[PDB]
Write a protein that binds this ligand. Structure first.
Ligand SMILES: N[C@@H](CCC(=O)O)C(=O)O
Lengths: 193, 419, 132, 150, 49
């Protein structure tokens, strides 16, 4: 009964879930998190006055680029990195040691910047509206965003590997080296009796 | 008047007014007798997620607004060259703004200026959830084929060398290797296959360790067998609107039927690209979202194409959990809603700035949590109360079938070898 | 929890496992004889009931091969049966009742879920001041 | 046009010794299209203040090529020196307020278009025009998998 | 005999002879396997609280 109990149902419930989770509300020195300096997430993160104190923690450390931040979180330095959904999704797909957790907030897509007044600004909009319902954007997303390297975390029932099998195999094989000794001592005792 | 972005309620039964957090809408009925005239002057009250958005806009851009319902068309399609409906009402100078579930495509944007989108929208098929079978040969799942062959070779090696040298060295017939394999199989299998025990201290010492390994093996093995004998893998009916099942419905065993509501954006988008698909869909055109939902539920249909947001809302807030969207949240031609403004206007910049300020304020999340959450939207509950049907056990019966075949062939093999 | 002990297994499964023991017993007896009958039947019944009855094992080669896998089949059956009956004998209960005052059930009240209070009282006054 | 490095969108690989990008085929079987940039050195313009031609390609580059083909114009893409997405520095120390990074380069007349994962919000849309979204997205958090070894 | 069968087993015992005795022993073994699968359903929970 006890060995099955530690062989099933043993895992953390879930990671941080909400943006207003008490850990981010009262930030300590043990739990570290940051983002990229001079970016829109920090601007929207400093406009939420109700979490102004948290911004102080965000003001403690801000990396120069997102690549440096991923390299830092890679080598067990930073705990949580807040970024865009698409970039973090593609990173979790390619780099298979990190996991994105949370619900999306402050949803705003990417738009092509341009000047205050220009005819190109007038017809690039119609050009993107035409090229998005013609299968071009879906094809580009399937070509450049859809790699799917690793498998998934589908369910809780997990199969077994050669972890304890080696131990039980060694325990089984150990017997014969003592059995031969006992047989030799048995012949010795039979000689004396 | 549609899904709870905007909804219309009748007059109060006795109060003759409308309650708090509500704005009065006007409705004009022209479906009466055409004898003299009747401009259907009726007053109801509008409420919803989208009217809260309109309120938040007008509470900062500083103007006042009357509301009025269109009585020409649902959303508007180009019929003979005259736009009729909400787009027609906007382009005919009878009004200025159009708020609601208006989608941003190429034609309407070419004829009417659109604001920034405030919600996601797209094409997504919704189907009834189909039953899934259990993976056969699952009895070998809470293991690895590696450890299977490892147990095989380990048993063979240890049995042969250890017990053979133990019986041959230390002082009923003699100990044959058949007895050696028979004894060790029973002990690992939990037991009772009658067997004859050997003699000698070393043999019993080895049998004790083998019995310890056997009790180890069978307690790990039976730790989560119930979980592995229950889990089933579902399958999607079709990948999307790109396979042969949707594009080419001619060469198909009993025909898969699908359709949608005509006079809309999805209808034009399908007619422009997929000719044969639209030609086949013309037969199964529905006449409303509720009628189509009930017809899909009863079994008269198996695929429904509509806007992704409202279909997701209906799948979430449904009695029980019967149907689901295909792809688990996939969107084709992902567009967004908006607010139509007259051509060559000035309020567009202020409206866009107000919408972006509302986005940066975070009120959109609260409004979505208040008006867009669903019950069935949560993941499926824990699966319990199984029945252990014939599938998972016939998966094991196949082993007896193969064993009986092997016995039958070995019988005639030995009979021929005897001659 | 159902008031029975044959619940974790379907009836057709019971019929199949009842026919299989007889089929394998007849096959074992015939193969061991034409290459002890009642003894083979007791053996095939005891290897499944795990009881200590059953005098001897068969001497035929293919009969031994068949019994070797029949024993494992019976053990897998017994193991699966034991595993399922505990599973419905533990961890089966509703998670919790209504928890919050703003719970979606009270937000959208239907005719199936009914609730009320005492008229002309303070709870109704505070319950009619929450415009939301 | 100015672009910024981004993991899934724009790649920056060094060019070959000859001066042309090493043509490499993809998995679908189509030749990958690449453009040559004029980007800064390895670390920053601080110590090694010098530009170097590099190779650029990806989703934004493909969309740029599609637009240039469909409306028949030409371009000369080059990276941004500051390496920042953009922020309006309004410090009262120098009595002036101005944008930095990509938006600072765009507003100053250096470039005409920005083809990059530039978001949309109030402050940025106040000064420049934003076209229709070319991909929807949101904000999320990234952690390391615990890999329970209980 | 009946104690061993209920206890899961192996205490060596000598089996009786006669069809009726074995028929009764079969039902007793069924009851024994019933008894010990219910018994070992949640012992870990009762040995922890
Ligand atoms: N939202 C669509 C109508 C619904 C649909 O076609 O799915 C429109 O404005 O045209």
């Amino acid at each position: 009964a006890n060995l099955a109990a530690f062989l099933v149902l043993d895992r953390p419930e879930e990671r941080i879930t909400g943006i207003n989770d008490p850990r981010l509300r009262n930030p300590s020195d043990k739990f570290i998190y940051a983002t990229v300096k001079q970016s829109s997430v920090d601007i929207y993160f400093r406009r939420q006055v109700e979490l102004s104190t948290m911004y102080r923690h965000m003001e403690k450390h801000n990396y120069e680029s997102a690549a440096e931040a991923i390299q830092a979180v890679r080598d067990n330095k930073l705990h949580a990195f807040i970024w865009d959904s698409a970039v973090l999704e593609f990173e979790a797909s390619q780099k298979c040691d990190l996991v994105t957790t949370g619900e999306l907030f402050f949803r705003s897509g990417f738009g092509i910047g341009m000047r205050k007044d220009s005819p190109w600004k007038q017809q690039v909009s119609l050009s993107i509206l035409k090229s998005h319902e013609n299968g071009f954007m879906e094809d580009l997303d399937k070509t450049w965003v859809r790699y799917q390297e690793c498998d998934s975390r589908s369910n809780a029932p997990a199969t077994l590997t050669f972890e304890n099998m080696a131990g039980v195999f060694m325990l089984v094989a150990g017997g014969i080296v003592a059995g031969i000794f006992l047989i030799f001592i048995e012949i010795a005792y039979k000689r004396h009796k | 008047e549609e899904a709870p972005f905007v909804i219309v309620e009748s007059v109060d039964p006795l109060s003759g007014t409308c309650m708090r957090n509500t704005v009065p809408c006007q409705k004009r009925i022209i479906s009466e007798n055409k004898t003299d005239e009747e401009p259907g002057y009726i007053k109801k009250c509008c409420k919803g997620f989208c009217i809260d958005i309109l309120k938040k806009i007008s509470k900062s851009v500083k103007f006042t607004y009357d509301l009025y319902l269109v009585t020409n068309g649902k959303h508007g399609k180009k019929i003979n060259g005259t736009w009729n409906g909400m787009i027609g009402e906007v382009v005919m100078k009878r009004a200025y703004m159009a708020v609601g579930s208006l989608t941003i495509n190429e034609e309407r944007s070419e004829v009417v200026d659109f604001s920034v989108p405030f919600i996601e929208t797209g094409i997504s098929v919704m189907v009834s959830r189909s039953n899934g079978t259990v993976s056969p040969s699952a009895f070998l799942e809470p293991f690895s084929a590696d450890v299977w062959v490892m147990m095989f070779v380990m048993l063979l090696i240890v049995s042969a060398v250890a017990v053979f040298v133990f019986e041959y060295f230390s002082p009923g017939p003699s100990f044959t290797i058949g007895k050696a394999i028979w004894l060790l199989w029973g002990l690992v299998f939990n037991n009772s296959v009658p067997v004859q025990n050997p003699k000698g201290t070393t043999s019993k010492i080895m049998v004790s360790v083998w019995a310890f390994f056997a009790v180890i093996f069978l307690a790990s093995y039976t730790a989560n067998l119930a979980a592995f004998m229950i889990q089933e893998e579902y399958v999607d009916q079709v990948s999307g609107l790109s396979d042969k099942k949707f594009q080419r419905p001619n060469d198909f065993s009993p025909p898969f039927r699908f359709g949608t509501v005509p006079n809309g954006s999805t209808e034009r988008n399908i007619r422009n690209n997929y000719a044969e698909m639209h030609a086949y869909m013309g037969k199964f055109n529905q006449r409303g979202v509720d009628d189509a939902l009930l017809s899909l539920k009863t079994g008269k249909l198996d695929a429904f194409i509509y806007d992704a947001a409202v279909l997701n809302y209906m799948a979430g807030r449904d009695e029980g959990c019967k149907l689901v969207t295909i792809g688990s949240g996939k969107v084709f031609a992902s567009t967004g809603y908006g607010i139509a403004i007259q051509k060559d206007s000035g309020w567009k910049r202020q409206v866009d700035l107000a919408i972006l300020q509302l986005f940066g304020d975070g009120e959109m999340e609260e409004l979505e949590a208040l008006w867009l959450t669903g019950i069935c939207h949560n993941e499926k509950n824990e699966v319990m109360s199984s029945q252990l049907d014939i599938d998972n056990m016939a998966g094991v019966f196949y082993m007896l079938g193969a064993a009986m075949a092997l016995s039958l062939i070995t019988f005639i093999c030995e009979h021929l070898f005897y001659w | 929890t159902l008031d029975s002990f044959m619940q974790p297994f379907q009836s057709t499964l019971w019929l199949l496992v009842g026919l299989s023991v007889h089929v394998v017993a007849v096959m074992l007896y015939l193969l061991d004889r034409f290459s002890t009958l009642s003894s083979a039947m007791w053996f095939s019944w005891g290897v499944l009931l795990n009881s200590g009855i059953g005098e001897g094992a068969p001497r035929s080669f293919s009969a031994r091969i068949l019994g070797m896998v029949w024993a494992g089949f019976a053990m897998i059956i017994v193991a699966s049966y034991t595993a399922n009956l505990a599973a419905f004998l533990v961890l089966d209960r509703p998670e919790e009742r209504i928890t919050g005052i703003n719970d979606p059930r009270l937000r959208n009240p239907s005719d199936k879920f009914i609730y009320a209070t005492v008229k002309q009282s303070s709870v109704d006054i505070y319950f009619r001041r929450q415009v939301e | 046009i100015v672009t910024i490095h981004q993991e899934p969108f724009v790649y920056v690989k060094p060019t070959m010794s000859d001066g042309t990008c090493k043509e490499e085929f993809t998995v679908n079987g189509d030749p990958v299209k690449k453009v040559i940039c004029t980007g800064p050195n390895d670390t920053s313009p601080g110590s090694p203040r010098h530009t170097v031609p590099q190779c650029c390609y990806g989703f934004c580059i493909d969309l740029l090529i599609k637009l240039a083909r469909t409306m028949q114009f030409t371009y000369e893409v080059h990276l941004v020196a500051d390496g920042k997405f953009g922020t309006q520095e309004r410090v009262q120390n120098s009595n002036k307020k101005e944008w930095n990074g990509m938006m600072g380069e765009l507003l100053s007349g250096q470039a005409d278009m920005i083809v990059a994962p530039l978001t949309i919000n109030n402050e940025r849309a106040q000064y420049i025009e934003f076209s229709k979204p070319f991909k929807y997205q949101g904000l999320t958090i990234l952690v390391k998998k615990e890999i329970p070894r209980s």
